[PDB]
């Protein structure tokens, strides 16, 4: 039984808050949160989701308001049943932080051909559109399996 899901990216301002809120809307009886591998080093802790990420999600009827970026820690990992990373490369960075969490760590895009979800940060709204499309397709697949 996977009830608590942690969506992980690097800053926790773009992809991972979007994935959190998209999955949360699809799985209302589950607890979905998100965290960033380098949120602390990037000085992003407490920051809201990127304005374009909020805007694009809003246009797809998903609320990414009231988000606060947080750092991924071993303690945080122990609280969640399933961990979903945005890129395959994030796994090595995750294991460095929480080696014990590798067993429950999977790819957000696992069921859509194990696709990595590209970072739209610092780019135009079109890049955020692209990322949302992939996150949406990926989350819809996870929801069918959970
Ligand atoms: O939260 P994301 O989607 O990784 C965007 C981002 C945020 C900070 C540093 C790099 C990339």
120 alpha carbon – ligand 1 mean position (Å): 8
Domain that holds residue 39: 1-146
Which listed residue (14, 15, 21, 77) is catalytic?
Answer: 15
CB 74 within 8 A of CB 97: yes
Ligand 1 atom at minimal distance to the Cα of residue 12: 1
**Is-catalytic flag, 122?**
no
Q: Note the resolution in Å, 1 decimal.
A: 2.8
Exposure string of 56-85, with b = 16+ CB inside 10 Å and e = fewer, is: bbeeeebebeebebbbbeeebbeebebbbb
CA separation for the pair 72, 83 (Å, rounded): 11
Counted domains in the chain: 1
State the structure-solving technique: X-ray
CB 29 within 8 A of CB 35: no
Pocket of ligand 1 (CB under 6 A): 9-16, 36, 42, 44, 119, 121
């Amino acid at each position: 039984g996977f009830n608590k899901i942690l969506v992980v990216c690097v800053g926790n301002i773009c992809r991972s808050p979007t994935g959190e809120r998209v999955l949360q809307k699809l799985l209302p009886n589950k607890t979905v949160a998100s965290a960033g591998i380098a949120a602390e080093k990037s000085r992003l802790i407490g920051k809201p989701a990127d304005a374009m990420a909020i805007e694009v999600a809003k246009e797809n009827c998903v609320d990414v308001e009231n988000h606060q970026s947080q750092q991924l820690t071993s303690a945080l990992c122990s609280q969640y049943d399933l961990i979903l990373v945005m890129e395959k490369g994030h796994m090595e960075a995750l294991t460095q932080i929480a080696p014990e969490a590798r067993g429950k760590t999977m790819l957000f895009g696992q069921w859509i051909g194990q696709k990595d979800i590209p970072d739209p940060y610092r780019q135009s709204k079109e890049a955020f559109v692209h990322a949302y499309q992939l996150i949406d397709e990926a989350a819809q697949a996870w929801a069918k399996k959970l």
